[PDB]
A paper describes a structure:
FMOs typically employ the phosphorylated nicotinamide cofactor NADPH to reduce a molecule of FAD within the enzyme, which then reacts with molecular oxygen to form a (hydro)peroxy flavin species that is the catalytic oxidant in reaction. Natural variation within the phosphate binding region, and its influence on nicotinamide cofactor promiscuity, was explored through the cloning, expression, characterisation and structural studies of FMOs from Cellvibrio sp. BR (CFMO) and Pseudomonas stutzeri NF13 (PSFMO), which possess Thr–Ser and Gln–Glu in the putative phosphate recognition positions, respectively. The structures of CFMO and PSFMO revealed the context of the phosphate binding loop in each case, and also clarified the structure of the mobile helix–loop–helix motif that appears to shield the FAD-binding pocket from bulk solvent in this class of FMOs, a feature that was absent from the structure of SMFMO. In order to shed light on the nature of the cofactor binding loops in CFMO and PSFMO, the structures of each in complex with the flavin FAD were determined to resolutions of 2.39 Å and 1.83 Å, respectively.
Crystals of CFMO grew in the C2 space group, with two molecules ‘A’ and ‘B’, representing one dimer in the asymmetric unit. The CFMO dimer was made up of two monomers, sharing an interfacial area of approximately 1207 Å2. Analysis of the CFMO structure using PISA found that the interactions that stabilise the dimer included six hydrogen bonds, including those between the backbone nitrogen of Trp108(A) and the side chain oxygen of Glu124(B) and the side chain N—H of Gln320(A) with the backbone carbonyl of Ile145(B). The monomer of CFMO superposed with the structure of the SMFMO monomer with an r.m.s.d. of 0.77 Å over 317 Cα atoms. Each CFMO monomer consists of two domains, an FAD binding domain and the putative substrate binding domain. It appears that the residues for which there is poor electron density are part of a flexible helix–loop–helix structure, incorporating helix α8, which is found over the FAD binding pocket, perhaps shielding the active site from bulk solvent. There was substantial residual density in the omit map in the putative active site following building and refinement of the protein atoms of CFMO. This was successfully modelled and refined as FAD in the flat, oxidised form. In the case of CFMO the side-chain oxygen atoms of Thr202 and Ser203 are both orientated towards the putative phosphate binding site. CFMO was observed to bind both NADH and NADPH with increased affinity compared to SMFMO, as illustrated by Km values of 3 and 5 μM compared to values in the range of 24–27 μM for NADH and NADPH, respectively.
Numbering used by the authors:
A (entry chain A), C (entry chain A): 13 to 227, 243 to 360
B (entry chain F), D (entry chain F): 13 to 236, 243 to 359
Write the structure that this text describes.
């Protein structure tokens, strides 16, 4: 029976925890992973961030520099691990929160073995656990291998395969870049993908949304190398799957052994279905981070819908600070 | 490492289990509840079915008869309890399945303490755990009590309250009927609610969809409501089933209607229904934009080792009813035995 | 060679014309119809507005009252006719504007027989001429009659037919109500339709957006009568057409002789394609009424995207006044 | 009241007309231009094709040869003029078709002064009249000159200017090549542009899509750029084909790039291409959300008395080219003669 339950223990949770720990109110953080790390523990082997440590730091404690390379997955995990420990956050892991229940004057946060009664709940569960794969005509038929980027690890199993990498943006480009080295790939995208200039990192992502808060594909090394191997040519979605291929709009067929779906993610709010707050679009209605339908619930770190850049290391701090503030207001009054 | 994992242990799971247990293939059933009973364990005190035991029976073993008329919640729980035990289904409870993962040639069904590798997964998790409450302007402001029908228990806490019962169909009518006796209620509905004739039960629900399933099967063309259970009939006689149309917004302690007038509201009981409770399938990527899965019959198009059973009209006409879930449950079992053979 | 060309001569054009005519600057209005009236000239026979004349008036001159009935189509046409004449707007009709061309320091507004050089263009062409019919699998096959609400006139040709009325909101309900009297109808809608209370008119539409600017189906008589004949039951979209029917999700077939598509309209900006300003969504990017890409172009009266309630008689005046203001500013400076 | 109305009178219209004129059925061609020529009448002064006359010929009558290499705009206009006249196509010009209306058993094709009742409509209106300019933050502010390639004529007005040529592919490269000589240009492109080898013309465009049409026909599986025309080659030699990536926003007299640096820009030539010019089909309700029509081949699914020809890859591989439009034009004629028979 604590004041604030933070569901999830990734960078967003950590961020809001940084801003609450000095306050009066109790909190616990529940996270589904074995160790610290958030979704980063499930990045592919070669995954690196698209901006340096300085543009990939949570509030307070900057990510330690990395030597001549954008931060690696393990390095991000490390930093979250150390960050969590540095500020001595009380995180219970592994814990799967199945539901958040309105018991009247407390919310109940429920897992298999334990429940927590709370005055406030912050849902910071990210997106990784809710990957999106669009349904195409023929999916029933397609015998070949299918793997969402969430679960992409290494290009080895795709060695020699006819592979479709599906979905634009950074994951598709980074995965294509890697898998095109060992397999014959086609990048399928809904729109012609748009690249940043070679000399700017994903900082420009943060910065664009700082301009918008004052009111596109990063050319990371592998992706740059893939341009040089003439492998970033994208095409438009196919019309349907066949048993071992796809048919494109022009009526032609192609063989496909494997599709890597880099089609992104939805907010992983399963644990909020019990609250009735999940809107038709699979999100929650918010003002800022705050649930309109349930104002003791805050949602943090999910995407543009919870705050410009909130689903980034550098960016999640604005809305995390503001969430902490609004929550401290709520609980004072 | 079994052949079929049935996620959930409500009447739908039971139904498909009845049809697989005689086969060669292994299965286990995982269910979230403490005991047998499915969502029925969470019905309100006075909840009764809208059709007799004969029209509320799973395959094989009929529900034992009940007096005067209509089976009670406990009686339905009882029958599921006994049904499960009668056919000796191996159900692990309580188990919360958090995700279904594609490991290549097995699906992994995952809970906190245990995982199961399976050749086939049947998701029969119902809707109760995914109640729907529509957002209205002002929900942020509304200080008064809010309770979805999922959690409605008894009218006692609403004693004397100004209550909105929101949402038509059977739950709203049955809850209104009960809560109007002790509180001042307004039934708010998107459309004028439509009542069945007083002398027909929810059997007509089943029957309509049998006509429509005779139609789809045979190939013929066809075309295209509140049961008057006792309490609901009584509520008509107390002139209490007058419904009005949605308000425009909440205020801190009321709602403002379209005409601009305000009303005080202490409590809103949302009888606005439920979505399919497929949280455990988000990990599979199969959840479509409408929060469902794309199916042919019960079968997942995107993931054909996954079947979905018992959720609603979208998994089969009448599949989300005791009597009705058996068609699609038999056909799921058949299709699954085909797949594995 | 005038200062302002107003393309289109419906209520939106009229509205902005009311606000410019007292100013210094010249303007002409070009409209495609034979007579005054805008899209109203193409309403079905029984079409009436969903709110009284007082809640269906343009600026200045109120619509004359109507006796115990919401204003009729002819009455709206009449009022536009008289309104246009009352303020002596110079409207050239019939004139089809095919394109708006950037000639440097003038825009050129082009029709077959005439061109106009202008400092400013206001596009107030409404939506009627750009009806939307969604494509369903099987449309190629469907032999039966098809008619968008734009062209619906009377229920007589549907006499005895198996009819699908497709699309919710007011047109579907009003057309269903009428056609269900003489044909066997199914109302197909993407979502369960939501009715206003019986004693409130489409004024509540205006009012909702006045609340939002300070910051759903009207039960018109026929539609009320149709509820009483138990005919407003809606169902969800079918999955596909067959040659003489549709197949629903449950796999069942139904015979359909006729589909009336009440699936609405897009903005009728064909004449702006030449300007390059039509965004991917088939609209123009705006601040208020003003084209971002082409700031001598204003768009008025189209929908929520040009202004809350701007596509209504009562509502179009806010954004029409503001357009006139912004245009008078532009041309002074 | 004719059988077939062909809307538009460019090379696509001509092509399908070649294939219908020997048939029994009447047709008329309506075209918006003052003279024959299609969009070619609006090409820039120095515009030449990217492949020789032999690879730029419509069906039947080949384009007459040209010296040194590559047919000029006037030469293409000429050939369309003569082609139209040679086969005596009845083309009404200038006629702007504003809408195509379904009157039941005829389609009505409408212009200001005249209407035509038709059993079949072929929309062959190209893309030129629907140029695309993407919106960037700051477009409201940008005071400097803006000109889509559609209207580019000559580099003279850009003399000495700081110019952005926006958009890759052939137009941007050809316009840059010309304007870089007289102005200070930056080529802005979404991706690094890719050049064909110096010794191959836009024939390779046709040929790629013949391989792909041999593939679709025969049923085999297959898989899935700037021609180095003379001026463009010259521009490489002047080191002027260096492209950069889109800027982030316009300012009043410049752009700000991603790195945060600013540049002055007097003029932007948008070589960002074209959409299908189907305005006259909005009235039919057939325009899909992507601004196209749903087709099987050339044929409208929603309105099967409507065919669309010559627009791009979506109406047929290479159909928006002189050499390429003939496959789909023959097949359209065939399908239309079938329909009417
Ligand atoms: C492929 C990829 C590349 C990216 N690259 C970058 C980059 O270069 N720079 C950048 O700034 N951002 C990047 N991001 C974005 C973002 O920083 C990561 O997505 C990060 O995972 C977001 O952290 P989070 O805390 O919002 O979500 P997560 O890291 O997912 O944290 C949520 C935590 O909550 C847990 N959880 C979920 N549900 C429950 C439950 N019911 N009960 C208990 N725990 C639960 C999860 O297991 C997880 O441990 C990238 C994202 C992806 C997918
Ligand atoms: C108010 C109301 C009245 C109704 N009245 C009738 C009636 O009169 N007659 C009739 O025939 N039908 C009626 N129904 C419909 C239907 O019979 C019930 O909804 C019933 O619960 C459907 O059974 P099910 O097995 O499909 O779903 P459920 O009964 O919910 O069973 C699914 C089981 O799966 C479990 N589960 C969910 N998620 C997980 C997970 N991740 N891991 C493990 N287990 C999980 C649930 O806890 C539950 O135990 C009614 C429904 C409602 C809401
Ligand atoms: C079925 C229906 C019912 C409605 N009911 C109501 C109601 O009850 N109350 C209410 O307030 N609103 C109602 N509306 C909304 C709105 O008031 C009407 O749509 C009205 O038509 C909008 O007027 P407008 O001037 O924006 O558009 P329009 O009336 O279409 O005016 C545009 C004019 O521009 C012309 N035009 C188009 N393109 C060109 C071109 N290229 N060159 C020259 N001229 C051109 C058109 O022919 C037309 O004459 C309704 C709309 C519909 C469709
Ligand atoms: C810069 C550029 C370079 C190109 N170079 C080559 C090349 O080298 N080789 C090659 O093979 N192809 C080339 N193309 C492609 C193609 O040959 C041209 O686009 C050509 O115009 C396509 O012919 P069309 O008949 O399909 O379209 P169009 O030539 O535009 O003809 C359509 C006709 O219909 C008319 N029209 C439009 N709307 C209406 C209406 N509502 N009513 C009546 N008439 C209407 C138009 O005015 C036009 O006269 C090029 C295209 C561009 C833009």
């Amino acid at each position: 029976s604590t004041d604030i339950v933070i569901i999830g223990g990734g960078q967003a949770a950590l961020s809001v925890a940084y801003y609450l720990r000095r306050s009066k109110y109790s909190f616990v953080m529940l996270d589904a992973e074995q160790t610290p790390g958030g979704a980063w523990l499930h990045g592919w082997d070669s995954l690196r961030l698209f901006s340096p440590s300085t543009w990939s730091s949570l509030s307070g404690w900057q990510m330690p520099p990395t030597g001549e390379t954008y931060p690696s997955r393990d390095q991000v995990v490390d930093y979250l691990r150390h960050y969590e420990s540095r500020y001595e956050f009380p995180v219970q892991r592994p814990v799967w929160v199945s539901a958040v229940n309105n018991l009247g004057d407390r919310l109940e946060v429920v897992s298999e073995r334990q429940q927590w009664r709370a005055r406030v709940v912050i849902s910071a569960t990210g997106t990784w656990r809710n990957p999106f794969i669009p349904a195409y005509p023929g999916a029933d038929l397609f015998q070949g291998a299918q793997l969402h980027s969430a679960h992409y690890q290494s290009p080895a199993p795709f060695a020699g395969q006819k592979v479709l990498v599906v979905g634009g943006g950074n994951s598709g480009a980074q995965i294509l870049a890697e898998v095109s080295r060992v397999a014959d790939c086609t990048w399928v995208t809904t729109s012609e993908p748009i690249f940043l200039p070679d000399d700017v990192d994903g900082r420009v992502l943060f910065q664009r949304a700082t301009d918008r808060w004052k009111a596109d594909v990063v050319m990371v090394p592998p992706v740059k190398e893939a341009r040089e191997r003439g492998a970033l040519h994208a095409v438009r979605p196919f019309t349907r799957f066949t048993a071992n291929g796809v048919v494109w709009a022009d009526g032609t067929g192609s063989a496909v052994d494997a599709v890597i779906w880099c089609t992104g993610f939805r907010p992983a709010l399963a644990h909020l279905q019990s609250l009735g707050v999940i809107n038709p679009d699979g999100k929650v209605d918010l003002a800022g981070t705050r649930s309109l339908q349930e104002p003791r619930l805050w949602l943090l770190g999910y995407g543009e819908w919870t705050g410009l850049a909130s689903a980034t290391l550098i960016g999640v701090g604005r809305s995390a600070r503001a969430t902490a503030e609004e929550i401290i207001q709520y609980l004072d009054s």
